[PDB]
Amino acid sequence: VTEEDLNVLAQNLKDLYNSPAFLNFYPLGEDIDIIFNLEKTFTEPIMWKKDHRHHRVEQLTLGSLLEALKSPCLIEGESGKGKSTLLQRIAMLWASGGCRALKGFRLVFFIHLRSARGGLFETLYDQLLNIPDFISKPTFKALLLKLHKEVLFLLDGYNEFHPQNCPEIEALIKENHRFKNMVIVTTTTECLRHIRHVGALTAEVGDMTEDSAKDLIEAVLVPDQVERLWAQIQESRCLRNLMKTPLFVVITCAIQMGRQEFQAHTQTMLFQTFYDLLIQKNSHRYRGGASGDFARSLDYCGDLALEGVFAHKFDFEPEHGSSMNEDVLVTIGLLCKYTAQRLKPTYKFFHKSFQEYTAGRRLSSLLTSKEPE
Amino acid sequence: VTEEDLNVLAQNLKDLYNSPAFLNFYPLGEDIDIIFNLEKTFTEPIMWKKDHRHHRVEQLTLGSLLEALKSPCLIEGESGKGKSTLLQRIAMLWASGGCRALKGFRLVFFIHLRSARGGLFETLYDQLLNIPDFISKPTFKALLLKLHKEVLFLLDGYNEFHPQNCPEIEALIKENHRFKNMVIVTTTTECLRHIRHVGALTAEVGDMTEDSAKDLIEAVLVPDQVERLWAQIQESRCLRNLMKTPLFVVITCAIQMGRQEFQAHTQTMLFQTFYDLLIQKNSHRYRGGASGDFARSLDYCGDLALEGVFAHKFDFEPEHGSSMNEDVLVTIGLLCKYTAQRLKPTYKFFHKSFQEYTAGRRLSSLLTSKEPEEVSKGNSYLNKMVSISDITSLYGNLLLYTCGSSTEATRAVMRHLAMVYQHGSLQGLSVTKRPLWRQESIQSLRNTTEQDVLKAINVNSFVECGINLFSESMSKSDLSQEFEAFFQGKSLYINSENIPDYLFDFFEYLPNCASALDFVKLDFYERATPPRAVSLF
Fold it and tell me: How many C-beta neighbours within 10 Å does residue B532 have?
């Protein structure tokens, strides 16, 4: 293998993203479905470049980010599906004849932070698989540098990231000044402060428009069924604004399988299914406690959850000492937190008010409790 | 070996499928026979491409799928013989001079998900066997790619699939974007969601036409024997629609070996043989439990089976916790399930109503049980049901299913038939529908109003149910004091235009109890010509 066939492999890269796995959503193991296939669901992402002060600076979309792009990305957004497969499809835009700055990269490689295997470049072979056999890893670095700007990489899996297989992960980002290719560095936000000193670019995924998010609802629902829902979020302004994030939409999308029109009817009972899903996600992730009883920790801070409605704020600071493990919920996403100086936890995963049902629930846990007191 | 001899091996592939094993059906170890040789039995498959929403999009057959084909297939259908050998014969169509898009592939290889052996390509050698000796596995992949679209592969065995020999199975499908050949990926449906993200094509095997399915019956049966059966599914619309699937056909096909014409006679007793066959298939597949007592789990959910007739639905959600193992039946096929978001189990393997006998059977299991209280528990399931009335819904037929199930015990059933005071239901029925008139009759001369039978309109509706019930436990003279009393104070009225064949049926063992009824009423139009009527008297 030589570099003259990089006009072969490049085409192959364009067909790496030409598959439903990239285009069908939530790609496994559920496949819930979160929403729908990514292409009908896909739209330009609300993002905002931020300052070092810790506040937003300008409003970007990828379409306007294309020529303004720099590397590494410290670009971040609130947890959920997030970067999803939409950046993958952004690559797919590089492979759909997209704007020139998507072709400003002769080769584009999707990268997986979430899974890794020696030899470490073969992770991509263990993922992308289009890796030719002649190219040793040194050869592969030498090859990549033959060009120096003609490759882009998306890193997928920032919380999923663990200590195992940790080296030559920061090398793409920190040693990017000598790796010469550009790259988009995946972030969750709990974690971001682990690379807040590496990336020449940085943006915050702003909450999506409610209206734009209805373009999500549309893909599975009949269009009148969507209009029925459109009447349904008129029920309340708190319901109407749920559509800011695609996740709330997913919360009401999971319900249409049995119904032509529905409500919960409570905005909170909608919210509870999502909490159980949260339990579902973290069962492998108990991170201490017994079985599912890590769940018990949210209950341990239940009178706290009680306090979110009650202390006029959904924001808390985890208790000093062994109870700091309460911020397990940030790990769970019940309480995901914003990196900031003198930072303290909040429930927002997008919309901290989402935690209102649990506060009502704790009261219920009190009402259905073993004794009158 | 080189590629210039791929015009040799290709011909050999065409004779791989040129064998009875491909063409004779169910290919081992039974060979039941399911139906017949595949060629007389073979027809174009009802399939429907589906959307990501989880509903059908268009109606395809393979013949129209030939040029529209894409790869991988997520194409699926309800469990049974399914893809059978019919796709194998589709290959055989590629090797029978078939349409151009079957020859759009220079080489076609049948693949077995069900059995595998290293080296893994030699599985095909251990199956197809036409694998030349020079071709190492790398050589074989390089060779296959020399062409990049000129090979098709059918994967056979999706539930049969296991963890052993699992790698380079998804490589044909997921790494198909670099394997360049097309391929049809076998699916069962319980399993499908394991590749719902790999296949560029996807279709749902729609239930076959009843009429088309008779082309199945024809291959073993004499043609008049088939016509006799054609009269036999006229017995009931539920029987008539059984032919939607080839399996129900197999259920009645297994019976012709001793008979020129037959019935079960119950649509359910037909259904029971199929259940036992289900037990037969899964004995190697006990998947927990002791011996055959995995069967006991359906019984464990027996009061559930009871509920399928009873909870107006054959659909259930398996119990949270260790009992989720109940969906063993999905593994068994008693309850196969549709993949879908927020999915819960159903009995359909094709036609979930098939489970109606087991619900009747559970009641029987209660009636034949070691003690009177379990029987009364079975009886308490009759505190659930109001008269024949419920012929409109799942418990109507239920007493039938109770009876095909048990003998003497249906006297208990006859007791509730005496506990009927509702007269069925009067909705949608009128004493002025039988004559077809809006004007005074002879029956009208007997009364001061236009109506009256209407009030107790289903007095003879009861009788049709009754002849079936009499017939179902084959209840002879044993249940006669009851039936003299059950049709008492009632009248039956027949039109000549709509004369049933089933009235001489009751007259099996008890024609005399006809005089429990008051008047049998007959309307004779068009011509005085009634020899068919008298034959009854």
Answer: 10
